[PDB]
């Protein structure tokens with residue numbers, strides 16, 4: 105009878121990553137409506153897709169116009185005005201030189217699968233450089249190059265070099281030590297001439313919202329590029345204005361050969377894209393096909409996302425409003441010693457929970473999960489990430505308001521204090537742990 | 539528009555994402571027709587390859603999409619149950635025969651659904667081997683292409699442990715039903731022990747392989763040979779599913795009782811949506827095993843509910859048998875005028891026309907001739923494609939809402955296009971760019 109109980113009976117566990125009992129019947133602005141009518145503040149952005157919140161007029165108009173006058177349902181078969189104009193848009197807002205082209209897909213997973221498939225074929229090189237903790241997708245091709253603990257049920261693609269992502273909060277490995285490790289692999293067991301590409305998250309997402317040390321990723325890029333290794337930046341998570349600039353890679357001085365877009369590009373509709381040089385992206389006809397990719401409904405939604413971000417200056421606003429939210433969370437740390445760090449850029453914010461500030465020992469996952477659950481009871485939706493399952497993740501809609509930040513901060517404040525005073529029971533969160 | 543949409547597409551769209559059969563470049567769509575830039579209204583016999591099951595601007599789909607995008611119940615089923623997606627899953631369980639506990643996973647495409655299927659079948663069964671068919675097309679992502687047998691993906695080696703068998707083809711009958719079963723029995727007795735085989739993947743009509751309907755009883759005998767050893771039986775309904783063949787599921791023509799069914803294309807009505815229906819012990823194998831952020835989002839799943847509801851309410855399975863029969867028969871009678879029409883096969887509104895350079899040998903027509911027929915179709919006001927291991931089978935997958943007057947308009951256009959091409963009235967340079 106309850107939506108949540110119905111879900112339990114028909115939805116497959118393989119597709120669940122559920123942090124709380126929240127079960128939804130609608131949304132409006134930056135709030136989500138639980139079954140029963142309770143209005144929850146969404147600090148999750150549904151993990152990134154909901155860039156403009158829910159029921160946003162620009163996305164609604166674009167999707168209305170397109171589904172009523174539908175310009176086919178397959179870019180592979182038929183050019184349509186929305187998908188071609190979106191590609192034009194993406195080339196216009198993404199700096200780059202030479203001839204470049206755009207491929208469309210449904211998800212970050214399929215866009216990285218495309219990237220891997222076309223890069224290895226255009227180079228006929230089979231080795232790939234990526235990062236421990238990197239999350240590039242959960243389909244066979246994109247999972248295969250990912251380094252995240254969650255996909256260790258399956259072996260990596262052969263010839264993947266996994267490096268530590270240098271972490272300024274837990275600096276086991278300095279930038280310099282990681283580059284030296286790469287250099288040593290290049291001179292030995294991973295000759296750079298047999299490497300197709302390096303894959304870079306400009307902030308390490310599911311690995312724990314780790315902003316790398318300054319200048320490291322520009323130095324990585326330059327080391328790879330000397331050997332004609334193509335430089336791929338995954339902007340799926342932190343892309344499109346969220347970090348204070350249009351592309352997170354613009355913080356890091358990068359000039360990538362290829363950019364992968366997803367999540368928030370769709371504004372809550374499935375939409376991904378790969379932008380690369382024409383010589384790679386025109387490798388062969390009919391090489392990476394999905395029937396409804398580049399369909400006029402999802403692409404029209406993507407055009408509205410980009411248009412709103414530019415016209416309303418949501419990059420600058422994410423810097424300002426994210427600074428406010430970040431600073432509110434830092435102040436909570438004078439109250440709650442479990443807050444060890446507040447990091448990220450703009451409206452991509454992670455809060456690192458520690459059981460001890462000295463050692464920076466991560467707080468146990470049970471505590472982290474209980475804070476989420478308690479936040480849900482108090483009226484906010486969020487999640488956690490990190491290689492130690494201890495980093496609270498805030499990825500709210502870019503439309504988040506200053507009064508909502510106040511509300512968010514008070515909820516987080518209360519949920520931490522409650523959980524630390526033993527408010528939430530083990531059996532309440534057992535359902536949402538693996 | 540001096541800068542045509544076609545030209546703009548050439549400047550910015552990746553060739554890897556193209557499978558273009560004509561210059562048709564779109565600004566809209568209405569009913570069963572597509573609107574070319576400049577305004578010309580084209581009859582859609584392609585159904586955009588299957589997704590457009592109810593055509594374009596269909597009011598049930600328009601309504602579901604409007605309500606969901608305006609009042610959006612989150613955008614991620616992996617994070618949050620939503621009413622649309624839970625209800626669609628309930629709908630798919632209800633309309634798909636099956637026994638015991640079952641569950642539903644959602645995705646965006648046939649390719650991601652079959653990737654899911656292969657990943658979870660091997661993991662849950664603890665068997666590594668897969669049975670598939672030569673010419674089968676289960677997708678174009680790494681995991682789904684890996685179990686596929688089609689000639690377009692021979693640029694990449696298959697997944698290790700895949701046994702590829704011929705699909706018995708009544709029109710080019712190199713391999714009988716009995717011969718294929720014998721060959722499988724032989725592999726089972728030697729180098730492919732059947733207790734190491736997770737699953738067999740079955741297209742109930744071989745789609746990109748040439749719209750081949752198997753010989754009667756073959757698929758049921760294949761099911762039984764595999765099931766006898768605990769091999770799970772997977773039917774791919776992505777292409778010919780959901781009423782198009784005259785029954786709700788194409789496998790219901792073939793006496794099949796699958797363990798797992800894969801849906802896509804038309805399920806979404808033009809929005810991206812796929813699904814896998816499987817037994818609970820497989821589908822609940824582990825949490826967070828096959829995740830895609832926006833899968834099961836309330837917009838795409840609402841569109842799917844509208845598709846299924848319209849198909850049941852308006853009786854579109856029953857209609858497609860009747861209307862597809864009329865269309866198929868028009869096409870057959872065209873073989874009296876045009877000897878290039880070697881066969882018309884299919885079920886319901888999944889129809890293939892096999893073009894041959896010789897009626898006796900059944901040698902496939904050259905691909906340049908087939909491309910010219912599509913191009914001339916397009917100029918005459920109809921959009922269609924070709925398929926097949928020899929690039930010679932005209933494909934007709936129109937919206938299930940295709941009208942009887944549109945069937946006459948279609949048959950006439952095809953008739954005129956074949957005639958104009960055979961009489962040497964279509965240039966080589968006009969099709970050069972689509973091959």
Ligand SMILES: *Cc1c(COP(=O)(O)O)cnc(C)c1O
Nearest residue numbers: 211212213240241340341830831
């Ligand atoms: C979420 C994510 C992906 C995968 O996107 P899906 O839409 O979940 O398949 C890929 N790369 C990064 C950096 C991500 O955060």
Ligand SMILES: *Cc1c(COP(=O)(O)O)cnc(C)c1O
Nearest residue numbers: 394395647648649676677776777
């Ligand atoms: C088209 C098709 C697929 C793949 O669907 P996409 O949405 O193009 O990835 C899978 N199986 C069959 C039988 C198909 O016809």
